[PDB]
Amino acid sequence: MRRVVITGLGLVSPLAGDVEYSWKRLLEGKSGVRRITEFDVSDLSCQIAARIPVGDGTNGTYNADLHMESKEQRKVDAFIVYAIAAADQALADAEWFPKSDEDQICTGVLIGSGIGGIEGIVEAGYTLRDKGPRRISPFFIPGRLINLASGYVSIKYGLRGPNHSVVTACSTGAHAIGDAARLIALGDADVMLAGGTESPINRISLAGFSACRALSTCRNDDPERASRPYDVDRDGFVMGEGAAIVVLEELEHAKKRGARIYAEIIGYGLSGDAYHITAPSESGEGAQRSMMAALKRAQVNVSELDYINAHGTSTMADVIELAAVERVLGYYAPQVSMSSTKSSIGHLLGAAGAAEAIFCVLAIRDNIAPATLNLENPSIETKIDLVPHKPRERKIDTVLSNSFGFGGTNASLVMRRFSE
Amino acid sequence: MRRVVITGLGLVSPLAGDVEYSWKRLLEGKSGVRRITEFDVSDLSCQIAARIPVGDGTNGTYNADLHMESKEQRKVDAFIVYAIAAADQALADAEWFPKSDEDQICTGVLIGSGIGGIEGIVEAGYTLRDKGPRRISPFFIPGRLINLASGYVSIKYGLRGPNHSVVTACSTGAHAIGDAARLIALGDADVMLAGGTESPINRISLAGFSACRALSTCRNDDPERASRPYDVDRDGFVMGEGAAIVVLEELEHAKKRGARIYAEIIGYGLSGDAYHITAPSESGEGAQRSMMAALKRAQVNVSELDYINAHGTSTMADVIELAAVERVLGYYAPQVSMSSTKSSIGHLLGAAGAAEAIFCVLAIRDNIAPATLNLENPSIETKIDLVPHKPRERKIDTVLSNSFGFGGTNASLVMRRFSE
């Protein structure tokens, strides 16, 4: 297996339309969570979300028009646009714009989404009913298929390597990165764009998650306090939106061209709960196996771990994951920092695992553990540092990131500082 | 990398609710294509589809009730039910029902869909608009997520290994099998259920694919003749439905327990066109790269190839693939049989690549190449044997199968008779 490194980062998040402003604001303790004003939510029990700040592109805002022409945007659901934007960033960051046949052929794209084009499907359904089939757009299908994020990105940049997509709810972005890394390690590609995208902030999605009682409902008038992983007063997740893309690259390829390497991906672990369609396993056994698998692949002892980015969605399951991590770490619990950045940007669903992978990379770069916001009163005492309220500056060389998706689909990633 | 074999087959198709009856009718030259009677299609340009024969389970019919309780079926879109049924078959065929922790943990599931729960999303949309958010089902989300196929199957059978899912339109089922095989080869699992499922026969999907003029329209009065890959009079694909699942197993694990081995998976190739959102590369270069990649991985020379299962959807693109195959085969073109079974069962979308893999396996078992039905007047002459009208009995030890999906996502698989 060839070694795989990370050479570019792209992010459109509820904190900012780019990577560096997202990170800056994350570390400053800012929240992306607010009352929804874009559409009617007066009849919903959840009236808040973590939303991308829209604008002209200055001061960390996001301008869709800079990434895709207006008229083109109208042919696709937003998840595709977000993916294009994050990719634009990533490629630029990696300084990788393949032109030659050789370069284009060895560069692939693997972008997933949990839900994809749900909004567009509903709107087309209304057209069909109200206006009939002759009014359905020729672009209905492509603008709605999950794999068309990979497709659109591939077309824009002439990326002719493996073109692939995954869908695993909350663990989508993590699977994307792990799978893409394996394609490189196995020799199917030398460079991959990888990550996740989601645009679930719409009435149908909000009603849907409210219906299975998954969302926070008691803090519609105090949005910045709603997302509170580990806190005794948590009451469900806050839905977010965005896209997170990394450029993965074979080590010698990167070295040869003088690329700046952020970190190395060294471990990937997968498991299944086989328990329940939406509830996580009460035993945390699946989570534990995911982590152990990732660590074993990475040949990393828990004695070497510095920071864990939790799944930690602000649901009752928070403490199941906590207990599992305690079991994994054993004696080393007091020396590992673990936090949930969902406390700041909500739950990005399909993009979550990728955004968090990004945060992990930057934790290494800047030797700082992001905070768990709002952690006023932990449900249970633990020896693990959950980094309440404010980030912690500390040595971070080796990191583990967890993603535990609906359906009982678990993924864990291990990354480490690149020395050589 | 450990070797990976196929030890179980499961299939719910437009010819039959099981594998053996599907294969039997396929070889008899039967078509699963008929006028749609279940819902109104009078206002649609395409009024035909390849539909699963529903019944009490006898004489090759499909009874959903035997696979999932009625009350449970009402909570999910049909793609999930098909998957369950196919999985039920495959595990039975493999005689693999893990009960120990060890056996459960080493058995995973990787089932994809191209489109998933589109019908249910549209229906929930109508509810949302007409009755309001309060009336949305608590089961809306889980019953609609693509990955919940893997989820439901995992839960039913206590499969606690990697639980994963992919989405790549027409190449979904191929990616699933190739990806699942790699998980085994890499030690992440010892057994995997893998494949694809789709339930796209509904008004929204039909209107959608009609809108981008992907579907056959001129033979609504002669359905069994509509799907005619390579024929001068072809005019688009015929939408099908169903699920196809294989049990993949590490070689030594299979041998130790005395499992019957159908074939070995030895190659998997991936590429991207980077051309167009729905149309294939005019040059076929992507297709060509996918095939070559699979063959190289398999360490198979084209001189050893016996049978090719084409993507061949009955669209103008049929001859692009044909040309690409000719370039790959070169001098050996006359030695190889190639057919499209979409001529018989239509385009299963997410399930196509897995259904076709199954047909490959059986082509090996029975030394027989399925026909390309309806091939009266080929658009172009070729040295390749396109097996028109009736199947051809011949030596079949090494097989290649192609899947080329919307978005420019290509997959090829290479399988071979197992000797040792």
Ligand SMILES: [K+]
């Ligand atoms: K995480």
Ligand SMILES: [K+]
């Ligand atoms: K095929």
